[PDB]
């Protein structure tokens, strides 16, 4: 595409430079160009793709929430401007989510055979459908929610068969699926049950880990505990 004339390795190098420079839109464009070269992504390259788009869509979500709050307050006649601008931000956010989903569907997921890559991409698919669900209201809010759930469920099924309960991708998948249950699917009890079971099963497997792996796993376990403290 737009990055079609740049070498794959140069796109990856520039994505790392863009991360250092906090230029996340650039980072995401470089990583989109790298994916579109058609080769599978290494573990590090998958992380670059996820960091880039998470930062882009995170800024959009924060802006959408500010604007949605102002719009809800307004409903003196403020004119159409708050709604128009919230809609503009919403459409941009939806476009980024559709771009990420399109990369996953063409063709990252279908070529991902190892558990670490397939779970990673299916978790991303659940996440970006979840961000679509956050702004959805029309006749597809239900279908968007089901698409998020289905992606997270397939990732969970693979992760429980193929990864130890302390694996950081397995833990982060469970964390985010529990947030889906709490915030999107109106299932707080399922959120709490999943977070508790995930935490307890990880605790019981920590004895198998090196010092560095222990640090990685316990960091995500603390996020599960932080949510449980907020929810109970």
């Amino acid at each position: 595409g737009a990055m079609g004339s740049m070498e794959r390795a140069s796109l990856i190098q520039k994505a790392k430079l863009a991360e250092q420079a906090e230029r996340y839109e650039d980072m995401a464009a470089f990583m989109k160009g790298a994916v579109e070269k058609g080769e599978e992504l290494s573990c590090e390259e998958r992380n670059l793709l996820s960091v880039a788009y998470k930062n882009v869509v995170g800024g959009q979500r924060a802006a959408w929430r500010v604007l949605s709050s102002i719009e809800q307050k307004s409903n003196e006649e403020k004119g159409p401007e708050v709604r128009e601008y919230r809609e503009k931000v919403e459409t941009e956010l939806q476009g980024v989510c559709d771009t990420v989903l399109g990369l996953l569907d063409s063709h990252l997921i279908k070529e991902a055979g190892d558990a670490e890559s397939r779970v990673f991409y299916l978790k991303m698919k659940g996440d970006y459908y979840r961000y679509l669900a956050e702004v959805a209201t029309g006749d597809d809010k239900k279908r968007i929610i089901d698409s998020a759930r289905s992606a997270y469920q397939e990732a969970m099924d693979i992760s429980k068969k193929e990864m130890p309960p302390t694996n950081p991708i397995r833990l982060g998948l469970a964390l985010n699926f529990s947030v889906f249950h709490y915030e999107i699917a109106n299932s707080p009890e399922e959120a709490i049950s999943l977070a508790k079971t995930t935490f307890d099963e990880a605790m019981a497997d920590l004895h198998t880990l090196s010092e560095d792996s222990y640090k990685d796993s316990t960091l995500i376990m603390q996020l599960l505990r932080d949510n449980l403290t907020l929810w109970t």
């Binding site: 998470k54 996440d127 982060g172 947030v179 709490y182």
Partner: peptide, 9 residues
């Protein structure tokens, strides 16, 4: 509450 922050490689 909080999902994976995920904003730093």
């Amino acid at each position: 509450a909080g999902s994976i922050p995920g904003r730093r490689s």
